[PDB]
């Protein structure tokens, strides 16, 4: 357990600009065909978003690179990845991401997503390890590789899978999934949006609206988070790790006043970042 990959060079992080991003409903109350202004953590429009490749492949056979570092949670965390194939089963949120600190773990290995709030002693490099079961033609991924042990678990929960990929798109969609993670007053809300994107990597011009699946009272501040990668062993070819290539975008929410446009449907469409421009 606790397998660690440092490879050779982490490499400079890639950078991208999202014209419209981090749009979600701040207020639960339903509003239709009205204009409302609220101040909440939001991703600023037309702002640089850091791009990190969890697995990086050079233009040569193999040479897989573990380029994903621990990232500070900050005021808020935004996760965007095309993820046509789901390798980001879950995200680990902890103040120290260590034992003696309440750690939030999400696993999508099970058919229904499982959310845990127990202290976990995470290894320096934490990733899920997948072993062929050899029974029922199935592959099983273990969170034991991610953390040595679980103790003092304040709480636990079961939810529908946050990441769902119907597949068969063969491109033109990319099965893009957008996730918003924020902790306010000891309460954590997870937002899931699925948007078809023609562009292979660059985020689409169209606004995306995110709705919170559930509200969880974690009760502990989170100042660091890291992605989880499900990796399967590779056998002799003429232990295998970092199979495939994974790229993910992280945007940090900043508290801002956002103008909200409500459709007759009530879904948020247009959004304005107040300090971005004089208009």
């Amino acid at each position, epitope marked *: 357990q606790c397998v660690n990959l440092t490879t050779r060079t982490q490499l400079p992080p890639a950078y991208t600009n999202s014209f419209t991003r981090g749009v979600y409903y701040p207020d639960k109350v339903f509003r239709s065909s009205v204009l409302h202004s609220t101040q909440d953590l939001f991703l600023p429009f037309f702002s640089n978003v850091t791009w990190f490749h969890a697995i990086h492949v050079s233009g040569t056979n193999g040479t897989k690179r573990f380029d994903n570092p621990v990232l500070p949670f900050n005021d808020g965390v935004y996760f965007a990845s095309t993820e046509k194939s789901n390798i980001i089963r879950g995200w680990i949120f902890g103040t120290t991401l260590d034992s003696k600190t309440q750690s939030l773990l999400i696993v999508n290995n099970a058919t229904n997503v499982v959310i845990k709030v127990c202290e976990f002693q995470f290894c320096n490099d934490p990733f899920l390890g997948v072993y*062929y079961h050899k029974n029922n033609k199935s592959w099983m991924e273990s969170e034991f590789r991610v953390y040595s042990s679980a103790n003092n678990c304040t709480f636990e929960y079961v939810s529908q899978p946050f990441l769902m990929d119907l597949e068969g798109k063969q491109g033109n969609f990319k099965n893009l999934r957008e996730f918003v993670f924020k902790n306010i007053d000891g309460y954590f809300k997870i937002y899931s949006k699925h948007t078809p994107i023609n562009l292979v990597r660059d985020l689409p011009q169209g606004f995306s609206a995110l709705e919170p699946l559930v509200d969880l009272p974690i009760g502990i501040n989170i100042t660091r988070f890291q992605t989880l990668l499900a990796l399967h062993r590779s056998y*002799l070819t003429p232990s295998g790790w970092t199979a495939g290539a994974a790229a993910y975008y992280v945007g940090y929410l900043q508290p801002r006043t956002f103008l909200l446009k409500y459709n007759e449907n009530g879904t948020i469409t247009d959004a304005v970042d107040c300090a971005l421009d004089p208009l």
Partner: antibody
Amino acid sequence: EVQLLEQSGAEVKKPGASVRVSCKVSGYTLPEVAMHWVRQAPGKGLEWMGGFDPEDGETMYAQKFQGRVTMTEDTSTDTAYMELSSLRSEDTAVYYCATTTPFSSSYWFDPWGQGTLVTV
Amino acid sequence: SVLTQAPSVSGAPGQKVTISCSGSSSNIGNNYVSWYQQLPGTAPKLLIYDNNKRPSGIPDRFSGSKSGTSATLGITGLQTGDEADYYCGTWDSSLSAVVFGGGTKLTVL
């Protein structure tokens, strides 16, 4: 890549006994990969034994030797016990732990236990 | 056992000579062939798998072929340390098991 851990090691069994053979692994977990067994008599050749079947999912048993030797598995401790019974005069042979790929369409023995000699 | 290979063969060093194993359609015909090497009192080492694949750490000098029921193990660039027995094997559906030949102990002259 992966080296099989030592199996039985040194075992001495006078006639009138029977011996288990416990082959563990390292760098893999036991039930992601199938084990196998081969009789090797010194100054002689290979005689295959035991084994798991990629098809049908059963753990094979060599028909010639079927019923005399059995196998069990502890997945967490990676202990696979090969029990041979009813010692015979020519039965004693060096036994090498063997393993084939889980993906199937494979036959090559892959890593080896290094070899242990049973006694009759 | 059920297959055909001679006990021993000899050749001068640095030369090129191979070793073949004669099976049947019931064994080599529909099945892939493997080859193994063992030094005296040592661990038998996989030589070539599938008639076209060489395991990690194998000199590229080794090749292989399957012609009908006959499978030759390509052996080239003889070395002073190449003297050992080579074993043919392939999957058997007859007894539905794994089979081998008696083994052929090479000698580098």
